[PDB]
Amino acid sequence: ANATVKMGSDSGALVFEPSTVTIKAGEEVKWVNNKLSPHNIVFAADGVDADTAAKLSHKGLAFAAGESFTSTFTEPGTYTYYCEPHRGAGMVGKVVVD
Template sequence: MSRKLGLFIAAVVLVVSSFFVAVNPAAAETYEVKMGTDKGALGFEPKELTISAGDTVKWVNNKLAPHNAVIDGNVKLSHKALVFSPGESFESTFNEPGEYSYYCEPHRGAGMVGKIIVK
């Protein structure tokens, strides 16, 4: 009986310890990009952002609305709907490495462009 109990305890310890030894992938991050700079300029802040595959970018309406973020050649990640209220936001998760150029449709001509670099 005590041998069975010993084997049972050893099995439980092995299973529990395997949770601590297993490789835990890095948790995905969420990064914020302001639409409209703090100084009131028509731009994204930051203008360029480097993230890891699986991370999310949250675009937040800051100043001088309306804004959106259209990613060149990528309808799935783009947000063509305009946001008007301060603090209004939307998110995109970037799963594939690469460089993603984007712009605000109403303010592209004013230079409101940015880039996400996914490692």
Template sequence: MRFLIALAPMAFATACATSGPAVDGMTPASVAETVDMTAALNFSPNAVTINSGETVEFRNISTFTHTVSTTADTPAETQAVMLPNGAEAFDSGAVAPGETFTHTFTTPGTYRYFCEPHVGQGMIGTVIVNP
């Protein structure tokens, strides 16, 4: 038991040392910006700027379920979304209270995303990805 506990920090340090763009769905080790999903039904900060290949962490600090979505199924969602040319749409699915969702942005440009349950209340955010 003692052996396992001693090893855990080492494993974490190794993961950090090899951080880079996320591949194959691995959890990225470094987060460039954190965006909170709030009880006021907004993303805070509403807009963040990162460099290509960096990761944004979205934290649900509220008691509601939120999403981070760029896959539009309704006219309101279509109006909310903006994706750079060549960027693939992504969708967090339901992010429960206290949970997080991370996404690594590899295509430069301006992304506008929405929360599926709250797009009607204007829960929309922006990520600007510099080359």
């Protein structure tokens, strides 16, 4: 049972919601595209290893109100994701794989 995040409120404010998710080692997590596009979900190697952070990242440009991404949360650890454009605009989210 994957967690589901949305890249922006299903209204019109760019917030990652849920901004922090906790799910199990080996499960996956989905993201839903909404509004204020483009967004991407770009994981900084935020304590976790480069390769895992990379493979979990999505530099895919999400234009279609319908496109959704999935990441495999194998390695227990912290992954911290942001948007490339909105990186430092307060648009960030966090993952705790258990």
